[PDB]
Amino acid sequence: FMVSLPRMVYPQPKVLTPCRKDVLVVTPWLAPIVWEGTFNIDILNEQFRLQNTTIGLTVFAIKKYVAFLKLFLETAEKHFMVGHRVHYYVFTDQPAAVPRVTLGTGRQLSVLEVRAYKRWQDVSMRRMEMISCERRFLSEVDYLVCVDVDMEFRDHVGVEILTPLFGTLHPGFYGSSREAFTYERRPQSQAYIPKDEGDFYYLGGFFGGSVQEVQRLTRACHQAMMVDQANGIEAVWHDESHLNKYLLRHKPTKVLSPEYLWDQQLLGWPAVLRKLRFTAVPKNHQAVRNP
Numbered sequence: 001f002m003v004s005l006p007r008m009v010y011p012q013p014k015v016l017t018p019c020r021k022d023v024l025v026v027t028p029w030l031a032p033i034v035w036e037g038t039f040n041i042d043i044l045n046e047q048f049r050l051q052n053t054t055i056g057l058t059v060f061a062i063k064k065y066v067a068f069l070k071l072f073l074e075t076a077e078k079h080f081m082v083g084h085r086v087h088y089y090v091f092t093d094q095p096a097a098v099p100r101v102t103l104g105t106g107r108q109l110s111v112l113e114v115r116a117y118k119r120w121q122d123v124s125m126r127r128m129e130m131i132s133c134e135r136r137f138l139s140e141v142d143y144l145v146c147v148d149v150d151m152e153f154r155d156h157v158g159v160e161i162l163t164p165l166f167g168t169l170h171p172g173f174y175g176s177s178r179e180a181f182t183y184e185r186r187p188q189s190q191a192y193i194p195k196d197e198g199d200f201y202y203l204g205g206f207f208g209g210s211v212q213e214v215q216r217l218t219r220a221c222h223q224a225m226m227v228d229q230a231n232g233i234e235a236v237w238h239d240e241s242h243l244n245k246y247l248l249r250h251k252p253t254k255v256l257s258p259e260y261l262w263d264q265q266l267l268g269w270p271a272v273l274r275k276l277r278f279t280a281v282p283k284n285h286q287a288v289r290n291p
């Protein structure tokens, strides 16, 4: 049950003026695409606070990636779901290396120890299995948000993202035609998408939804990866390839614009991006991913 919103004073939405004319703001299956200028965060904060919404945020910090936790968590504290209840779950092979970050009221952090895998491909892939900690999330949070660690929040990332199932547009492909998307293209892979299918290229690094829908997604991607292994094939972009196939066949109820995961070093700051909210931290691939 959802009590009445209190009286609020805000700009009237006008039917005969779009919030943004430069970008697509709803998908052909009527899911909002979340850009700056599309949402009144005051209205959304009300609706979500009245529900006493708790958001879990998952983050893997295995081997050398523990170094990214301090900036990731301190900037989450400045910009992620502020004012709402938040439960961070830090999955790591080095519990003692998790930095001591001071949290705002109503926010908590759990350290979950997991095995490290040698191959960075396997570390990335096995997130899906490790997420799908099954009874725990169900009892502790309403939504789960699953992101990469080698990132920092620079601007607001709040309840406008929450919905049963969301993906995020990959910042390198939001302008491309589908034939150029780097979907898995070999029909022997569970992740296979033919050249005339596909809505968008979503990122492995930022997806989420209700606990129920995230567990479905992560369970399905984990089972598909297990079939490919048995068949001696490994998807071209690993977990991200399977996530793309899943979201093709199970349409997300919201899509986040590339404001929600950007790399300014590689792509600059285009006019179409009014805010850069959560962004890649520079890293040396070869050195950070190997002993």
Ligand SMILES: O=c1ccn([C@@H]2O[C@H](COP(=O)(O)OP(=O)(O)O)[C@@H](O)[C@H]2O)c(=O)[nH]1
Pocket (backbone or CB within 6 Å): 059, 060, 061, 062, 063, 064, 065, 120, 123, 124, 147, 148, 149, 150, 205, 288, 289
């Ligand atoms: O040695 C590793 C490699 C990967 N990761 C986790 O897997 C994620 C995805 O890998 P990465 O960020 O290296 O992929 P990229 O964004 O460069 O494609 C990282 O954000 C970490 O959360 C990790 O913890 N340790």
Ligand SMILES: OC[C@H]1O[C@@H](O)[C@H](O)[C@@H](O)[C@H]1O
Pocket (backbone or CB within 6 Å): 170, 172, 182, 237, 240
């Ligand atoms: O083509 C897909 C790839 O694009 C790169 O820009 C990215 O760093 C990879 O992790 C993967 O998403």
Ligand SMILES: [Mn+2]
Pocket (backbone or CB within 6 Å): 148, 149, 150, 205
């Ligand atoms: Mn990353």
